[PDB]
């Protein structure tokens, strides 16, 4: 398994491979394209992955999407691997979780104007830095904690602090938000990571591919801190339905694909069964 950084390392160590890589990069960014394709289908850049929380993930993804030829699903460039009161108490007794926790809270709970509720990009940056370098027995315990009443569900909803990040003035079109997320490098890669690990299945007994709860939970929580950042819909104790901040309105004749894209978050038996079995 060769990641794209070392694939560029072996690419820059050779003359023909670097020539065909820069040739295809000048093609994308007939006959010049097809020869570069039939050469670089044997490159170490061909089928290179990236890692979660690796150093210079952005360059790895910019290299990986550079060789990609120009669509509901895409290939993931990654390695295919009171209760909530007690979760917060287990965080605040460790030192690494406490510092970054107070970091994203003291950033995201700063009202600026009576119009601007909070700063968006710094709050997303703090949430990404929280959900990258914290051990996952702390994140999953605070974000997924089994509740029986309304106050526990409200604490669990308020954990990613949706008053700044999740909600907006309007609910835009889900397809437009998908286009915005697929414009950016990082959000498109996290969305493909979520699509590769959290589809429904008719063959496996838990409707999840490879019967892997862990990959679908990591593909869920890796979408926090982007524009396609989901959260719960209400403070329901047992009813657990996640959703991004959009809706099916404004769809036109593209209504069915919008509904099918939204049913990945609203009506996934794989993700809901994974959350329920993790709560058990």
């Amino acid at each position: 398994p060769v990641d794209c950084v070392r694939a560029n390392e072996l690419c820059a160590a050779e003359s023909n491979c670097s020539s065909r890589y820069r040739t295809l990069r000048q093609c994308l960014a007939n006959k010049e394209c097809q020869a570069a394709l039939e050469v670089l289908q044997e490159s170490p850049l061909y089928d290179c992955r990236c890692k979660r929380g690796m150093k210079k993930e952005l360059q790895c993804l910019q290299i990986y999407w550079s060789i990609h030829l120009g669509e509901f699903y895409e290939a993931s460039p990654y390695e295919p691997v009171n209760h909530c009161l007690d979760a917060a108490k287990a965080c605040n007794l460790n030192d690494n979780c406490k510092k970054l926790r107070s970091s994203y809270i003291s950033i995201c709970n700063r009202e600026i104007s009576p119009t601007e509720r909070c700063n968006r990009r710094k709050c997303h940056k703090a949430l990404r830095q929280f959900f990258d370098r914290v051990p996952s027995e702390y994140t999953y315990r605070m974000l997924f904690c089994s509740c029986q009443d309304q106050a526990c569900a409200e604490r669990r909803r308020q954990t990613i602090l949706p008053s700044c990040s999740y909600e907006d003035k309007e609910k835009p079109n889900c397809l437009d938000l998908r286009g915005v997320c697929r414009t950016d490098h990082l959000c498109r890669s996290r969305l493909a990571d979520f699509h590769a690990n959290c589809r429904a299945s008719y063959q496996t007994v838990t409707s999840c591919p490879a019967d892997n709860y862990q990959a679908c939970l990591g593909s869920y929580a890796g979408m926090i801190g982007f524009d396609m950042t989901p959260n719960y819909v209400d403070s329901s104790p047992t009813g657990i339905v996640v959703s991004p901040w959009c809706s099916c309105r404004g769809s036109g004749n593209m209504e069915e694909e919008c509904e099918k894209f939204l049913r990945d978050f609203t009506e996934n038996p794989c993700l809901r069964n994974a959350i329920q079995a993790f709560g058990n």
Binding site: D47, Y73, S113, P114, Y202, R249, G250, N253, M254, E255
Partner: protein, 572 residues
Amino acid sequence: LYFSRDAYWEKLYVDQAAGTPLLYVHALRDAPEEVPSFRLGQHLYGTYRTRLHENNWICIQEDTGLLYLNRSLDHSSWEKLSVRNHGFPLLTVYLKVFLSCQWPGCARVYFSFFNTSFPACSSLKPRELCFPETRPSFRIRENRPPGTFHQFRLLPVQFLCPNISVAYRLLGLPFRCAPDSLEVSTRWALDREQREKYELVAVCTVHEEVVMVPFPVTVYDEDDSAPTFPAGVDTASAVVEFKRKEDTVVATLRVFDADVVPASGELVRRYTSTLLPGDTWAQQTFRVEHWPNETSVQANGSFVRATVHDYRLVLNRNLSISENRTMQLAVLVNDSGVLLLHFNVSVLPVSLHLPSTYSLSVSRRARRFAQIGKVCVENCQAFSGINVQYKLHSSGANCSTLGVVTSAEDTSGILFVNDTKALRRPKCAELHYMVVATDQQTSRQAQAQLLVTVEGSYVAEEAGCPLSCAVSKRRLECEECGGLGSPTGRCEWRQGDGKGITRNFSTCSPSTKTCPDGHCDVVETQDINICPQDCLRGSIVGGHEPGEPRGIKAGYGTCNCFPEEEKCFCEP
């Protein structure tokens, strides 16, 4: 010509013989000249747009639209094709079908393969003998000549198990299931503008099990609806009188359209609003903003959706006071049907006169920077984008005591004591000022009289007094000493509650209507000793919550402040 769906589904096994019929396809025409041809893509696609090999086992009948097996299968070909999946488990392959990969120009067909061979007729449940896993969902245009779009039977199932008695059945509906041929057809041409959805229950019957399966039908739209007024409204009268800001929604109207087809990507490129020209003042001071919204309307007890476009009219700059005009604006609407709108706009000027004499007083015990009175236009809370500044002109030019600064929120000026000694003199006891109300953009101005009486006595303060009111902590030391901002000469004490972290925190202020107001005005922000609990940029010791730009929004207990160190304390 268009494909009825975009995904057909089929289950495969090992060692199925050649000539085995796999499935049917359907491609409904649009004009009475169109014959559905069917050509196949020359690659067995794997997963995530990956070619494996050219198709060499599945052939097609273009007339009946019959996908069937050209050759047989084995373990060797499938274990060969599973290698080129590049680290992924072989679960489903798919083919591309052209007709003359996206709907309706192309259709991809799925194949879910099993490494085991074909199981027995009795070893399969009738639910897996009637319908596939993927329940269908169809795409049908409006107002087109109908035909046949679906067939029920599973062809390798009855090809390999013909002895199982299986029937299919549909339940003023245009759809029908034919006898002796299980194709589904539609009687008349349909429209979404009557009804958009048709969900049905199809019944399979075996020997013995009766299986019900949902059957959704979706109708698509064309641009068959010109823009329409809600009820006769073609014009909108509006008056630009007081706001005159860079951007304020002047006029607003709705336009109905049952056409949905120009969706949000191409919605700008089709629904066109055009301000008709004629005056450059309109083109420098006006524009038309436009956006639709989907609403749900009833047709025959159903709920379909349509577009309600909203046209609003927006200013472009700060209109000055000297505008005394009126216009009529004409708007073209293109639903690519041609609609016209009008707007009677009337921009009326503003009078800026004031009441002539502001008779008022001031106590002698007051200190520096203490609020007294308010100078304002007759319409205080009408100005939005017009800057109005206030000044003073002392008559004798020897008894300068007071000043006026202007808050741009209310665009109004507040009296403040500037000097103590001139108020302290018994000579300058009744003072006459010319309050001149000026302007910035257009130099129309006015003036007025200010009579003020220096009234009362003077008493010295205590020996250990600080300079601000908020230094005191108890109640008695607050009122027995005088700070800076109060016009009473003594500091005032407001007393809160024991309800935890509240806005009602007990404190010592200059004025109980000005200092813990929650707003840092122009008077308090001059020198930071007046009201530290509304205007500081510092640190707070105690359970609290700070203000939104600055200040103490809520505290606990008693709250005092040292403005010399920008520090505050809150404690019961």
